[PDB]
């Protein structure tokens, strides 16, 4: 089956008492950045990848344009990069440390 | 204000690549067999109860037929018992340790 359809069909039959937990989970999945202890050292990363935000920032700082970053990592979107850049803006000390270490 | 319609909105906005993950999560949510640290000391239990799988297996192993379990614990369904027996079949060592004194 088509995946979007498969999920609609499941969600349409879901017990009402599970709606809140399902919503909370999918809302979490909407964030392109993920932090997971014991994955990439617990560092913030692009969701379901082994690409830490700081490595993207480091490659940019060393002169990689966005076209090169996206071309290198083929599941990566513009929104992922934009989210990485926003994460850096909100967490500059942490990321600058990761780059230095 | 309607969390069900909000859930519909968020699933429709989900990238293709995350749909399976969400499917698996929801299957876990609906599974008659639940495992979480804060209920039954992290032992496998029947959804919406504090009845561990191990207690149902112990009763079955002493000869309690399904109909007795269902009469005794009117919250349980046949799907719940069937799922308990499948869980035991898949995790026999774990359950047996829970039955044992310790």
User: Phi/psi zone of residue B19: left (φ > 0), alpha (ψ -120 to 50 degrees), beta?
Assistant: alpha
Task: Kindly state whether residues B90 and B52 are assigned to the same domain.
Answer: yes
Query: CATH number of the domain that A10 lies in?
Result: 1.20.5.800
DSSP H helical ranges for chain A: 3-12, 19-29, 53-61, 66-72, 78-90, 92-100
Q: Is residue B52 helix, strand or coil?
A: strand
**A45 phi, psi to nearest 5 deg:** -145, 165
Of all residues in chain A, the one with the smallest CA distance to B48 is A17
Distance CA A22, CA A18 (A): 6
Determine, for residues B8 and A10 on separate chains, whether the beta-carbon distance falls below 8 Å: no
Mark yes or no for CB contact B19/A6 under 8 Å.
yes
A23 and B17 in contact by Cβ < 8 A? no
User: Closest by alpha carbon to A80, among A39, A51, A43, A37?
Assistant: A51
Distances (CA, A) of B52 to A34, B46, B47, B63, B84: 34, 6, 10, 18, 9
**Co-location of B91 and B101 in the same domain:** yes
Together in a domain, A38 and A27: no
The length of chain B is 102
Same domain, A13 and A43: no
Residue B71 belongs to domain spanning: 32-102
- If asked whether residues B21 and B44 sit together in one domain, one would say no
Q: In which region does residue A42 sit, left (phi positive, over 0), alpha (psi from -120 to 50) or beta (all else)?
A: left
Nearest to A23 among B3, B16, B30 (CB): B3
Q: Which residues of A touch B30 (CB under 8 A)?
A: 14-15, 18
- Asked whether residue A41 falls in the same domain as residue A62, the answer is yes
Burial pattern A61-81, b for ≥16 Cβ within 10 A else e, equals eeeeeeeebeeebeebeeebb
Which of A20, A29, A48 lies closest to B14 in CB terms?
A29
Query: By three-state DSSP, how is residue A101 classified?
Result: coil
Residues of A in contact with B16 (CB under 8 A): 3-4
Q: Taking CB atoms and an 8 Å cut-off, how many pairs form between chains A and B?
A: 69
Same structural domain, A65 and A100: yes
Q: Is residue A52 a contact partner of residue A98, using CB atoms and an 8 Å limit?
A: yes
Give yes or no: residues A58 and A36 share one domain: yes
DSSP A32: S
Residue A51 is part of a domain; what is its CATH number? 1.10.10.10
Note whether B23 and B58 are same-domain residues: no
- Name the closest residue on chain B to residue A77, using Cα atoms: B15
Within 13 Å, how many C-alpha atoms sit on residue A66's CB side?
A: 9
CB B25 within 8 A of CB A25: yes
Q: How many domains does chain B have?
A: 2
Q: Phi first, then psi: what are they for A42, rounded to 5°?
A: 75, 5
Q: State the maximum Cα–Cα separation within chain A, in Å, rounded to a whole number.
A: 51
For residue A11, the number of C-alpha atoms closer than 13 Å in the C-beta half-sphere is 28
Strands A45-46 and B45-46, sheet pairing: unpaired
Residue reference for tokens 């480091």: A58
B43 and B69, same domain (yes or no) = yes
A39 and A68 part of one domain: yes
B47: CB partners within 8 A, 6+ apart? B30, B31, B32, B33, B34, B80
Task: Look at A4 and B23 and tell me if their CB atoms are within 8 Å.
Answer: no
Residues A52 and A87 reside in one and the same domain: yes
- DSSP secondary structure code for residue A46 in this structure: E
């Amino acid at each position: 089956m088509n995946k979007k359809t498969q999920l609609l069909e499941v969600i349409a039959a879901l017990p009402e008492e599970l709606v809140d937990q399902a919503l909370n989970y999918v809302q979490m999945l909407q964030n392109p950045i993920q932090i997971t202890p014991g994955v990439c050292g617990g560092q913030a990363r692009i969701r379901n990848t082994r690409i830490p935000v700081w490595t993207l920032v480091a490659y940019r700082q060393q002169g990689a344009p966005d076209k090169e970053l996206l071309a290198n990592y083929p599941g990566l979107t513009a929104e992922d990069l934009s989210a990485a850049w926003h994460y850096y803006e909100q967490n500059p000390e942490q990321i600058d440390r990761e780059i230095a270490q």
